[PDB]
Write a protein that binds this DNA or RNA. Structure first.
Lengths: 201, 93, 35
DNA sequence: CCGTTTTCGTTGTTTTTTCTCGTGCCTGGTGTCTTGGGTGTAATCC
RNA sequence: UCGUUGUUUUUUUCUG
DNA sequence: GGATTACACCCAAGACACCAGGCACGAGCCAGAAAAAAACAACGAAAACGG
């Protein structure tokens, strides 16, 4: 396998070019002599093709503008070959954070992971103005507070259970926000608790 | 493996005498045998002549006298002339 | 020292052999091969 | 109602190939010496 | 009710 | 004249000077003034529209 540098961000495009030119030249008198090629997310900008002679690699990369023209290629050790093809903790009840939407930057507890595994429910802290400026964005969010039925009724509605209130499609259970959340919007690892979390949580 | 021969050297000598003349492999082997036997004969003559005078090293004069002893009059004289000319050229330059 | 520096530099501002600023520059740098 | 789509924010981020003056400092193949042994020579004996 | 702070970065045309 | 003590000397080896190119820097006055201009490509959400 040889790793030839390619243009930043266009590595999957280069992979597609390799595959499609390999398909189109098959059976001709000048086919592409390759076996298998891959790109890994960690190895960004690196294009790996399985072959036996550097001429095949040059042919594969020749004619691509999505590649750095230089033949900055290198070999891979026997033990290192499996490393390039080695691909490489989400549990309910553990605390995770949000990184998307208008509640981003707030620690939350998972309530339920969907059966398919595409949306993960969370236990967030509502950020409610109680209808003061209803007429949002991740730069104008005011302070945070637990949902209060009394204050919510006083200032601004349906009750389905004792302690559960449905407000604008959002779920408030024991003063904590429940909502469906995409798994791409959250991270379960690399969390250092903050001072406010210690004071409250 | 690395079984050295005098193939290319004989080829070059042949090219400078008869440039458009080929050769077979067995003729090449015959030439190798002839050259090796002559080398052994001259070296042995030099060794015996050194032993006779109880001298432990070899100079060019020993080879000269060995060639005189081995080959007959005219051929020995011509070899002497060629060797002297080559040695003098190798010395001055 | 400073007084000598200024007294020598200032006159130069007001100005076959070569004479004048080029000559002074050559002298100061100790040019090995003058023009 | 709701699935397709532009859309407002967010999030992330490089590469088609295209004039001046000086000292100082940093390299080679050269150049010249000189070393050491071994060959060259001859002076003496009998 | 003293207090009370105001950008950088380049480029330009100018003055002696 | 073979034998014998005596030595001539020289030539390859090795140490060193140096070497003229190239190769870099790296500098190239003072104070003051004004106006005029200053990143953005793509992305997945999320309101958007007719289905």
């Amino acid at each position: 396998i040889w790793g030839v540098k390619v243009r930043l961000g266009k590595e999957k495009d280069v992979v597609r070019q390799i595959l499609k030119k390999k398909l189109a030249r098959e059976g001709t008198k000048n086919p592409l002599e390759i076996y298998s090629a891959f790109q890994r997310d960690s190895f960004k900008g690196h294009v790996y093709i399985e072959a036996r002679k550097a001429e095949a690699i040059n042919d594969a990369l020749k004619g691509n503008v999505n590649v750095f023209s230089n033949n900055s290629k290198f070999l891979v050790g026997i033990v290192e070959y499996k490393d390039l093809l080695r691909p490489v903790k989400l549990t309910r009840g553990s605390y995770v954070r949000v990184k998307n939407g208008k509640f981003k930057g707030d620690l939350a507890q998972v309530d339920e992971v969907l059966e398919n595994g595409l949306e993960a429910r969370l236990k967030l802290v509502p950020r409610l103005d109680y209808g003061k400026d209803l007429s949002y964005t991740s730069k104008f969010r005011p302070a945070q507070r637990l949902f209060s039925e009394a204050e919510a009724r006083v200032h601004e509605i349906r009750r389905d259970r004792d302690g559960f209130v449905t407000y604008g499609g959002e779920e408030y259970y024991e003063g904590f926000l429940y909502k469906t959340f995409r798994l791409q919007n959250l991270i379960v690892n690399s969390i250092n608790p903050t001072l406010n979390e210690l004071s409250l949580f | 493996s690395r079984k050295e021969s005098y193939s290319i050297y004989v080829y070059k000598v042949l090219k400078q005498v008869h440039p458009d003349t080929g050769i077979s492999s067995k003729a090449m082997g015959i030439m190798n045998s002839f050259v090796n036997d002559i080398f052994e004969r001259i070296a042995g003559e030099a060794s015996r002549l050194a032993h006779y005078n109880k001298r432990s090293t070899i100079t060019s004069r020993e080879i000269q006298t060995a060639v005189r002893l081995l080959l007959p009059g005219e051929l020995a004289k011509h070899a002497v002339s060629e060797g002297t000319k080559a040695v003098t050229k190798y010395t001055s330059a | 020292g400073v007084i000598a520096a200024q007294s020598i530099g200032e006159p130069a501002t007001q100005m076959n052999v070569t004479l004048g600023v080029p000559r002074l520059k050559e002298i100061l740098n100790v040019a090995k091969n003058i023009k």
